[PDB]
Design an enzyme around this catalytic site. Structure first.
Site, PDB file in Angstrom:
ATOM      1  N   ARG B 108       0.673  -1.385  -0.060  1.00  0.00           N
ATOM      2  CA  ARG B 108      -0.292   0.417  -0.128  1.00  0.00           C
ATOM      3  C   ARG B 108       1.063   1.483   0.188  1.00  0.00           C
ATOM      4  O   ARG B 108       2.019   1.835   0.674  1.00  0.00           O
ATOM      5  CB  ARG B 108      -0.852   0.360   1.178  1.00  0.00           C
ATOM      6  CG  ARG B 108      -1.278   1.539   1.486  1.00  0.00           C
ATOM      7  CD  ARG B 108      -3.232   1.126   2.266  1.00  0.00           C
ATOM      8  NE  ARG B 108      -3.180   2.497   2.355  1.00  0.00           N
ATOM      9  CZ  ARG B 108      -5.084   2.092   1.953  1.00  0.00           C
ATOM     10  NH1 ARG B 108      -5.966   1.264   1.818  1.00  0.00           N
ATOM     11  NH2 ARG B 108      -5.317   3.771   2.250  1.00  0.00           N
ATOM     12  N   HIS B 135      -7.885   1.376  -6.423  1.00  0.00           N
ATOM     13  CA  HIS B 135      -8.172   0.207  -4.979  1.00  0.00           C
ATOM     14  C   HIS B 135      -8.696  -0.531  -5.355  1.00  0.00           C
ATOM     15  O   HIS B 135     -10.597  -0.535  -4.929  1.00  0.00           O
ATOM     16  CB  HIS B 135      -8.858   1.543  -4.112  1.00  0.00           C
ATOM     17  CG  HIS B 135      -8.586   1.529  -2.555  1.00  0.00           C
ATOM     18  ND1 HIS B 135      -8.268   0.271  -2.120  1.00  0.00           N
ATOM     19  CD2 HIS B 135      -9.221   1.962  -1.510  1.00  0.00           C
ATOM     20  CE1 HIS B 135      -8.713  -0.148  -1.198  1.00  0.00           C
ATOM     21  NE2 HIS B 135      -8.905   1.163  -0.620  1.00  0.00           N
ATOM     22  N   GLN B 138     -10.855  -2.452  -2.361  1.00  0.00           N
ATOM     23  CA  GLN B 138     -12.554  -1.773  -1.814  1.00  0.00           C
ATOM     24  C   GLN B 138     -13.264  -1.678  -2.858  1.00  0.00           C
ATOM     25  O   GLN B 138     -13.890  -2.610  -2.547  1.00  0.00           O
ATOM     26  CB  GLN B 138     -12.025  -0.395  -1.997  1.00  0.00           C
ATOM     27  CG  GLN B 138     -13.044   0.288  -1.696  1.00  0.00           C
ATOM     28  CD  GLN B 138     -13.501  -0.267  -0.555  1.00  0.00           C
ATOM     29  OE1 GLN B 138     -12.754  -0.004   0.719  1.00  0.00           O
ATOM     30  NE2 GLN B 138     -15.174  -0.216   0.166  1.00  0.00           N
ATOM     31  N   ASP B 233     -17.124   9.640  -0.612  1.00  0.00           N
ATOM     32  CA  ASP B 233     -15.915   9.110  -0.034  1.00  0.00           C
ATOM     33  C   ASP B 233     -15.879  10.546   0.291  1.00  0.00           C
ATOM     34  O   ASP B 233     -16.485  11.628   0.464  1.00  0.00           O
ATOM     35  CB  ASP B 233     -15.363   8.722  -1.260  1.00  0.00           C
ATOM     36  CG  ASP B 233     -13.688   8.572  -0.104  1.00  0.00           C
ATOM     37  OD1 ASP B 233     -14.183   8.659   1.187  1.00  0.00           O
ATOM     38  OD2 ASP B 233     -13.038   8.400  -0.905  1.00  0.00           O
ATOM     39  N   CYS B 269     -16.832   4.156   1.153  1.00  0.00           N
ATOM     40  CA  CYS B 269     -15.420   3.325   1.917  1.00  0.00           C
ATOM     41  C   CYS B 269     -15.062   3.622   3.002  1.00  0.00           C
ATOM     42  O   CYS B 269     -14.177   2.726   3.702  1.00  0.00           O
ATOM     43  CB  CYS B 269     -14.668   3.698   0.266  1.00  0.00           C
ATOM     44  SG  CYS B 269     -14.459   5.384   0.367  1.00  0.00           S
ATOM     45  N   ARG B 314     -14.495  -6.307   2.992  1.00  0.00           N
ATOM     46  CA  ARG B 314     -13.504  -6.059   2.611  1.00  0.00           C
ATOM     47  C   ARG B 314     -12.294  -7.120   3.531  1.00  0.00           C
ATOM     48  O   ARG B 314     -11.563  -7.865   2.657  1.00  0.00           O
ATOM     49  CB  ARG B 314     -12.698  -5.130   3.994  1.00  0.00           C
ATOM     50  CG  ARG B 314     -12.790  -3.320   3.160  1.00  0.00           C
ATOM     51  CD  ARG B 314     -13.432  -2.933   1.585  1.00  0.00           C
ATOM     52  NE  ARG B 314     -11.217  -3.064   1.417  1.00  0.00           N
ATOM     53  CZ  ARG B 314     -10.116  -1.860   2.175  1.00  0.00           C
ATOM     54  NH1 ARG B 314     -10.879  -1.131   3.098  1.00  0.00           N
ATOM     55  NH2 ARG B 314      -9.011  -2.061   1.562  1.00  0.00           N
TER      56      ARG B 314
HETATM   57 CL    CL Z   1      -8.778  -1.740  -9.521  1.00  0.00          CL
HETATM   58 CL    CL Z   2      -8.915   2.000   2.466  1.00  0.00          CL
END
Ligand code: CL
Ligand code: CL
Ligand code: CL
Ligand code: CL
Ligand code: CL
Lengths: 323, 328, 327
Positions: B108, B135, B138, B233, B269, B314
């Protein structure tokens, strides 16, 4: 048995071990490596809990302890750098006694050798030195396993190698101790001001006399590298050290088509590190102690050497704590 | 399908076919059910995983750790260090060393180019837990969540709107995912904060083949009309201009009503600024007379909100990535 | 051999538990200690995943939780101090609900008791307090197990002990609550300004009146320590504080004033008992003293049980987790 003699020992410095004890650890490291790759590894640390104290961070050494521990069935607690060193608000004597009550083995990476020696005296469980100012013994065990794997049946006592650049530090010190213990021919090739501490040199010369080893300290690259099976360097002043860069020409000066190149890592060999672009400008060089050409060549065994960090740390823990 | 995924990296959804993505979602559902029934089989026994977090994320980290533990693996968490990879040591070198010791690696961090390098050099499965551009974990969690809450509808039958700032990893990934899965996605926000024009074009080309639709609009009413899901978000002294620009795109009960859909559900998220129970959230809302920013407390805590199912998912979807790529 | 259990309970503060429930955690700690030593330990947390949240660092508390968990078959995610305190970017109610979806149990060490109570209300899984501003309940369980191991057949309700120095803090507070709950005779021996919060003292006096316990607060060392089975202290730090606290140092003379040949010395650690620390030595040197709240002679004597007490941190945390989450 060397096995019986190693049980419950600390691993603080190679000076504390005999030739045969060191050879045992290396041979065990080779067996464990083979077993892992064959899927036949027997867990000897099952149920053990180990504390990993890093007063100075080192991801490479930490990962090698963690993976070795996991593979052998142990669990680990990583205690990283914190601004409050051991001995600031609690004595090492007290810290050692508490950790020893909870954990089955303790690794320590930090500052002075004196601190880990104190930990080793008071913990009541095996303590293992992952690096101090003075010594880096787990690195040199990896290095020696790697030399054996790449030297086609030659034993340590038959091997010649040169270390280039700044030898006045833990990795220099340990390489010199190790070479002396194992009967090897080591050259330290660098400016005289950066040779190892004279008292350690004298102690190593006395050990080397018992083992058939040889220790040569020299400012002369051509004479230092001639006939070498390995060339080793590390990060290191620039104008002073520049003549000791490992480049293809140094390789060619060994006169040995099979010469291999070792480096404990991390290495400044190109522009890709952030320091690399800076200094390729700042002193007009692409790479410092070693060139990209040598580092990425077929002569370079740096990643086998890095992998061997895990197998040799595993051997240390298995020999000392394994059941 | 399962055999196609073995030893693969998980770097972005652009790297996967429709059916592969569907497989990972179906696997996640199976693993979730097995965990809850106590019949989970460990497929990562003996595996060691490195978790590299150049930027910290407790949520993503816990999902990876719990998923690994449940599956019999062990983990080494390597957190932010003040020296980003590429400072003392190249990513090429770091990858080659980690790859010799670990069986799988999460990263990450910053640019996609970094994780792609790690994925090229490590020689073991590398999984992207977030980069500047994408991401992907997610969005798998999000799609599972949608399927669980859409009463037998398949992804290709689902319509949803993302509100606010779409020019970022989560927006990018939602748009890629929607295109790959044939969904009808509306990106609803100021034009300046739509996703990158080149990516949009690429996703339109994918959507044409899959039966999906991608609509970009500044108009909230038109964007949310008929949606099954609304997604947002966070948008953010320095933030005043961004709050005023984004305020029309707040998800409030009125936006829910504009869907015309009694069953509409709300996704986020996390973390979310929905009230004054955070220092930053209260500060900034107060500066504009608002209570909550991108979404209101009333919506966030309503029966329409599925954010906590989504957060839980997740873990189940990261578990599926690791199982499919490294499991045996 | 109990009628009740603590399954799925939080462990936030000793005030939340009855006398018998505390005793049960102490008896379970002993059984778990015995099993570990005998190699007969049964894993009751097999498959469980625990989050360890430390807003403030405590290696000692963390190691106790991690070893306990490992021994019991659980795995752990250690979340250290990080620059994002909970409630900065995300509410505790939201954090709690996410963590509770992923983990089977959560330890929290941090700031106010209110934070951990909120966590314990919303997580949906057991939440354990590893230290707040107000209470340190895990420490006091370890202390009480340690007392029972060193008191030759005496039950808690028969024990008398004195806490010397600064009692106005989590450890003082918890020792007083625990003493009251378990019917013990506690003396808080220190300057009056550093006695525990007066409202807590009143609450503990009411509890003590029900259990047969006694709470005495005094500035007088000789009277405070007379007859004590145990003497307990903790670091009190600095020039004004040192002169104020110096009369309450535990030295061999204080041991003698108990009149008890079998008196034992306890300390929650770390301790400033000599000059083998940077801080301890500087402060002691400026003031001409070798050690602060206790002397080297006492700390290293055969009267000192501080390392048993430190070890018992682990056994007692293990009991808390087994009791509340064990399967
Ligand atoms: Cl992606
Ligand atoms: Cl996250
Ligand atoms: Cl290292
Ligand atoms: Cl050494
Ligand atoms: Cl308490």
């Amino acid at each position: 048995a060397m096995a019986f003699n190693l049980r419950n020992r600390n691993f603080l410095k190679l000076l504390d071990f005999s030739t045969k004890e060191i050879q045992f650890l290396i041979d065990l490291s080779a067996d464990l490596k083979k077993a892992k790759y064959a899927g036949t590894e027997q867990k000897k640390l099952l149920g053990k809990n180990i504390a990993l104290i890093f007063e100075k961070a080192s991801t490479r050494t930490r990962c090698a302890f963690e993976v070795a521990a996991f593979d052998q069935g142990a669990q680990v607690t990583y205690i990283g750098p914190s601004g409050s060193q051991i001995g600031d608000k609690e004595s090492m004597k007290d810290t050692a006694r508490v950790l020893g009550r909870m954990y089955d083995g303790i690794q320590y990476r930090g500052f002075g050798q004196a601190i880990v020696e104190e930990l080793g005296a008071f913990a009541g469980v095996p303590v293992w030195n992952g690096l101090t100012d003075e010594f880096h013994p787990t690195q040199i065990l990896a290095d020696f396993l790697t030399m054996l794997e790449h030297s086609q049946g030659k034993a340590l006592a038959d091997i010649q190698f040169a270390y280039l650049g700044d030898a006045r530090n833990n990795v220099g010190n340990s390489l010199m101790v190790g070479a002396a213990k194992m009967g090897m021919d080591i050259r330290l090739v660098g400016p005289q001001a950066y040779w190892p501490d004279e008292e350690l040199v004298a102690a190593c010369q006395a050990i080397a006399k018992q083992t058939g080893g040889k220790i040569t300290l020299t400012e002369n690259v051509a004479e230092g590298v001639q006939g070498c099976d390995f060339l080793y360097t590390d990060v290191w002043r620039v104008a002073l050290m520049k003549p000791y860069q490992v480049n293809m020409n140094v390789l060619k000066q060994t006169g040995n088509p099979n010469v291999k190149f070792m480096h404990c890592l991390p290495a400044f060999h190109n522009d890709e590190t952030t320091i690399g672009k800076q200094v390729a400008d700042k002193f007009g060089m692409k790479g410092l102690e070693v060139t990209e050409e040598v580092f990425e060549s077929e002569h370079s065994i740096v990643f086998d050497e890095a992998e061997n960090r895990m197998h040799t740390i595993k051997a240390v823990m298995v020999a000392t704590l394994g059941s």
